[PDB]
Amino acid sequence: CTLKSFTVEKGIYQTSNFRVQPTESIVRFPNITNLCPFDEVFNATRFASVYAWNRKRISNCVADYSVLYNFAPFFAFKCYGVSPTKLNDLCFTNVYADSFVIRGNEVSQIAPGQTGNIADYNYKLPDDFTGCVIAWNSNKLDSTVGGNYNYRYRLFRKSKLKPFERDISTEIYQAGNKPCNGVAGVNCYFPLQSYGFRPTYGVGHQPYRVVVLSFELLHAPATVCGPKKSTNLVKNKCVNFNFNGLTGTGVLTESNKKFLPFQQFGRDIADTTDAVRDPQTLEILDITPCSFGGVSVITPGTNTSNQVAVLYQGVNCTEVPVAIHADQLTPTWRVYSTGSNVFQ
């Protein structure tokens, strides 16, 4: 099939790559398990104004997303750097929950790296925002028949706001010698404006609650983790593993590395994870992906014979039992049998 012919001449042809497949899947987390304060975010009576966006810190918890499993009528789970359904498979550290109430149609103005008057003078999201935004209608609680003018936004500033920057300085920008004294006119413009939450305005212009969840991924010791079932680990066996969101396959042997107490990930010259600390018991284990290598077929001409030999390049003969050997397939003499005839 590789040579695209029925007649194969005498030679060695690099046929494929053999990788000893994983045996089982083991998922690990720290033994401690706590209910994350995410519920308190959804149980909050009110959110701060957009000019003074509320910030909460989430850490040292297990991400219990049951709040969005059972009761999630939210209109947009507009995740950007991650998939909404993948949250259970990854752990986060130093999670930041920003929250405010804005107009529904202004979501396009809070896009990652978007530019706008609010995006320049109220709340600038970073151009490389790695997180999610959850917006849901708040007309039930954050709207009044007389007009909910309590929420106010900073309309104007001298300079554009930096990403993830909060400014509460209310100093007026007097462009002339005339003192403002609260008078709107020449060289005097107020930097704040009340929200136009008029009752006559329909949906979109109504208040909606927006929560921006910002995550920094795996470069720091993880503190927020998924609700997955913690299992046991095995040594010298190529298995799947999900260590606090770090997914991989290989063997996990005992490591004699002298990790410093603040260190979690060890890396080799190729800056890939060579060792990891078990989140349950703080001990260092060496990760080594299971054996693999090229597989070439040595054959005479098909005009002459049909028996073939197989070379597994650069692999110890203790990793041979895969589904080509006679011990794993039917005893057919076309290719190879008897178990013996192995040469290192």
Binding site: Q14, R19, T249, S255, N256, K257, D268, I269, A270, T272, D274, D286, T288, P289, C290, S291, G293, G294, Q313, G314, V315, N316, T318, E319, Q344
Partner: protein, 147 residues
Amino acid sequence: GDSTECSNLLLQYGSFCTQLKRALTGIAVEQDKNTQEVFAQVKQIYKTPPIKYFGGFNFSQILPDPSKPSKRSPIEDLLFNKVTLADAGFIKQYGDCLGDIAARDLICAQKFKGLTVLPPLLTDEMIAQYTSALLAGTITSGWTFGA
């Protein structure tokens, strides 16, 4: 790596992988052909006489050393030491032939990144034996062994 989705979408791209494999196989067989054309210029292996006296011309430092297991000449040993070594497929039961933990792991990391070095068809011992045959023919036969 080991992701199936990336391989499937790589299949959608056509056959650059096949062309690259063909080019690298051509490069490897070209390396073997280069070694054969440079060193394997004689059918027979020629043995130096047991008594190595040639009128006073001392070839001890270029002739093979019967003492050391490598059988390389002292000059060959100096050249081997001067140049940085390379993997030679040692049997260490590491799963990837030669390897160690917390050591010179650049080759191990390269292997785990998919880059592999295949051994030459002629081992350094057999390359040294070919060179010894060439030197024996030059010393004993002259230029008449090449025609």
